[PDB]
């Protein structure tokens, strides 16, 4: 059955290649999950960095009105 044995082993290796493809797909799912985690991390970090620092009255508006109050103060 050698004429058949070679082709049998080749089809078995093709099935093993499909299993390898499935493992590679699991690997790519892991990598994509890690990329998504990095994306959500940078997202949260940027939201935090641009929220707290700005929530404190650093706006030109608030400073300008405070400057009017200080101007009124000396009179």
């Amino acid at each position: 059955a050698t004429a058949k044995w070679t082709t049998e082993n080749l089809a078995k290796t093709q099935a093993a290649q499909a299993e390898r493809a499935k493992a590679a797909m699991l690997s790519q799912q892991a990598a994509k999950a890690k990329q998504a985690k990095l994306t959500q991390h940078l997202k949260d970090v940027v939201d935090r960095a641009l929220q707290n620092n700005k929530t404190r009255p650093t706006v030109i508006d608030l400073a300008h009105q405070n400057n009017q109050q200080m101007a009124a103060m000396a009179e």
Binding site: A3, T7, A11, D61, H64, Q68, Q69, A71, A72
Partner: protein, 422 residues
């Protein structure tokens, strides 16, 4: 039902394309977020403060209630114009990625559809081999029960039959998995698919590899992405060395305030004040500690990296184009070779049957010849399907893979055939 209809359902439902389109549109909209800082920023603020002194100010308390309407415009800020241009370039890159995803969908659809057809052919040939070996086994069993042959031939035939049975199991599994992958690609279960017309099947040699390489350099998408990334790196250099420049602003404001001084030592008087400022601010950094020079050098090194990515993409394109050319030529040669092999195997099988009838050969030889014949047939079928996939791979390398390249195939197809493993 065929390749065009399959591709239409896929294109309409495939979620990978819709996600890539979402990303494309998200970038083309982020263009507007990047343009916004150049437009009038209007804001409102309001404060209420109760000030109380406790050192040289005892009994000097104040209640201030202020409200301001601030406006801001940018008359000169090159960093923001460069950011807008960067976002336009990033949107272009996303559009090219969307094009690459369209081509990838076309290629995956065709590859899965042909994988299903090839699995059907493989199962059919395994069943035909099983039937042939079973006929031989029955002939031997009869000639033995009558007494014209020994049990050796019966047992050999039984072993070969069992091997073929195992192969049939494997082939059925493969067909089922191929149909499941086709459903994953498209989104529907197709019990009937248009089959390949092997009678009217033609193999045309692809055009010269030099023309392929020229069209690839001109159209291939892995190169357009690289060129656009190079331009993006150039514009990043420009943005970086745009930090030495000044900036102008048109800060305007309309503010109002009500101060109420209330204390025993409160010498000041109440006031209700208003103001309308129309300012013009100018900013110019003269030194920052080599920050801008360092950023410019980093941007230059990133541009060097982008140029090397472009060269790497050029090499990959050349390699894949030439590989696809060679693979198509090899698939043509293999189709011809396997045709001749199938004819010769059928002749040798007839020869083994005759020899076994006259006693010059044995039955293990007959069954080996049967296996050889049907292996040759399977190889021929796989060669045809690989030729089609390799044509598609060329047309993908050039970046010119579109629906008409599938209309060609769908014309190459023929009568329907069932995908059920029965």
């Amino acid at each position: 039902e065929n390749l065009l209809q399959v591709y239409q359902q896929a294109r309409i439902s495939n979620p990978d394309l819709r996600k890539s389109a979402a990303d494309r549109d998200a970038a083309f909209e982020k263009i507007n977020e990047a343009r916004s800082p150049l437009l009038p920023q209007l804001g409102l603020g309001a404060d209420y403060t109760y000030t109380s002194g406790f050192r040289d100010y005892k009994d000097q308390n104040s209640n201030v209630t202020s409200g301001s309407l601030q406006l801001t415009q940018v008359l000169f800020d090159m960093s923001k114009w460069r950011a807008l241009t960067l976002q336009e370039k990033a949107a272009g890159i996303q559009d090219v990625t969307y094009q690459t995803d369209q081509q990838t969908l076309i290629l995956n659809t065709a590859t899965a559809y042909f994988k299903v057809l090839a699995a059907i052919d493989t199962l059919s040939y395994t069943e035909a081999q099983k039937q042939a070996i079973y006929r031989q086994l029955d002939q031997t069993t009869q000639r033995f029960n009558v007494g014209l042959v020994a049990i050796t031939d019966v047992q050999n035939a039984r072993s070969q039959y069992d091997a073929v049975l195992a192969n049939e199991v494997t082939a059925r599994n493969d067909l089922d998995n191929a149909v499941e992958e086709l459903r994953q690609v498209t989104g529907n279960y197709y019990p009937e698919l248009a089959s390949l017309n092997v009678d009217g099947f033609k193999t045309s040699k692809p055009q010269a590899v030099n023309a392929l390489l020229k069209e690839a350099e001109n159209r291939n998408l892995s190169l357009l992405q690289a060129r656009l990334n190079q331009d993006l790196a150039r514009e990043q250099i420009r943005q970086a060395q745009d930090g030495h420049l000044p900036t102008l602003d048109l800060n305007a404001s309309s503010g109002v305030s009500n101060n109420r001084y209330s204390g025993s030592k409160s010498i000041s008087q109440d006031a209700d004040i208003g103001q309308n400022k129309i300012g013009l601010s100018f900013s110019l950094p003269l030194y920052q500690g080599g920050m801008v020079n360092s950023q410019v050098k980093q941007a230059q090194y990133n541009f060097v990296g982008a140029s090397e990515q472009l060269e790497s993409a050029h090499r990959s394109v050349v390699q894949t184009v030439r590989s696809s050319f060679n693979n198509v030529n090899a698939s043509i040669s293999s189709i011809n070779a396997y045709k001749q092999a199938v004819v010769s195997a059928q002749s040798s099988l007839d020869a083994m049957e005759a020899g076994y009838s006259v006693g010059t050969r044995t039955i293990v030889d007959v069954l080996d010849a049967t296996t050889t014949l049907y292996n040759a047939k399977q190889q021929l079928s796989n060669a045809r399907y690989n030729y089609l996939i390799n044509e598609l791979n060329i047309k993908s390398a050039l970046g010119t893979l579109n629906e008409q390249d599938l209309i060609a195939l769908n014309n190459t197809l023929g009568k329907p055939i069932s995908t059920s493993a029965d």
